[PDB]
């Protein structure tokens, strides 16, 4: 239908300074700065005030309009990453074989080392992405805390850890072993 114009309104909290130039968004907050390039999308930005930003698509078709609220949501996630942080909690699920999880450092790189998963002699290593913090929960047995400013990196490292623990050649309805994301929240509780 080629909608003539479609708009979304970003909301900037008091301590956050978004900064946009040539579709390169740099969001600054109390917790730090995050940057993202959006050169793969045709959008335009207008600063309504210091607390609001208009995001506009002119004469956009259905898919190109669909790509507008995703831009809004990504920048909002950047804003809440530098003002609240992100925290994913993972629970270790096993029926028989305890999962031995350590945070090791090899070749100057941080890794998550999973051992004895379903009794295997194999040692699983997951690279920890930059800007992502791992911690073994003390308050909970068999719990890993993945935290950081960027939601994308945190959720993708968590997914890496979950995916490396997939069960093969078994009835996965019965063999429910693995490492699963149990809680998706923020560093600053709300």
């Amino acid at each position: 239908m080629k909608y003539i114009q479609t708009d979304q309104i970003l909301d900037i909290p008091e301590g956050v300074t978004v900064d946009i130039k040539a579709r390169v968004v740099k969001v600054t907050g109390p917790r730090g700065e995050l940057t993202k390039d959006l050169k793969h999308i045709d959008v335009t930005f207008n600063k309504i005030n210091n607390r609001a930003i208009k995001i506009t698509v002119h004469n956009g078709d259905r898919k190109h309009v669909a790509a507008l609220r995703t831009v809004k949501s990504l920048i909002a996630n950047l804003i809440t990453g530098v003002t609240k942080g992100y925290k994913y909690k993972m629970r270790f699920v096993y029926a028989h074989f305890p999962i031995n999880v350590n945070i090791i450092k090899k070749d100057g790189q941080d890794y998550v080392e999973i051992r004895n998963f379903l009794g295997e002699k194999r040692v699983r290593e997951v690279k920890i992405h930059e800007g992502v913090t791992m911690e073994i929960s003390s308050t909970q047995k068999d719990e890993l805390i993945v935290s950081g400013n960027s939601l994308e990196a945190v959720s993708q490292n968590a997914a890496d850890i979950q995916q490396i623990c997939r069960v093969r050649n078994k009835d996965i309805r019965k063999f429910l072993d693995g490492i699963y994301v149990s809680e998706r929240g923020t560093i600053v509780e709300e």
Binding site: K2, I4, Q5, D42, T44, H58, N59
Partner: protein
Amino acid sequence: RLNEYQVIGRNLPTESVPEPKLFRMRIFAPNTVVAKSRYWYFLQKLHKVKKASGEIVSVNIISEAKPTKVKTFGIWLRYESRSGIHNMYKEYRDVTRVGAVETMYQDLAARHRARFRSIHILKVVELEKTDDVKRQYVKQFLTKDLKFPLPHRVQKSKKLFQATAPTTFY
């Protein structure tokens, strides 16, 4: 490229009926040869008359009343598809009744593969009230204080080669 015509015809007078009723149709045709042809096409869809037994009385061009006034038109259609016969209603923005019908013919060719031969124009009405506009693709141009840019302008060059980097500002 079309014109709107007023075509008036009648059955040939007989000693039984020496003044048959005069029937008029508004025909959108490229020229007067097709206008009188289209007239007989529709009379034989409605009345017991033929070209051999009838007579064309008058053919006149109907010019737009306000050709520099922007209007919204609603057009009622009856077209044939590959499978059946369908009624449809669509809306067009233009300054002349003829230019809306030309847009209509381009529009049904593109989205429904309906050729000129497959379309009957039931009615063309200028929508006076903003509440009369039913379709969103023309209603979006009736909003207050409408502004929009034209991003990514492509300039047509007379030369094959240009010595400076291309731009698309506008």
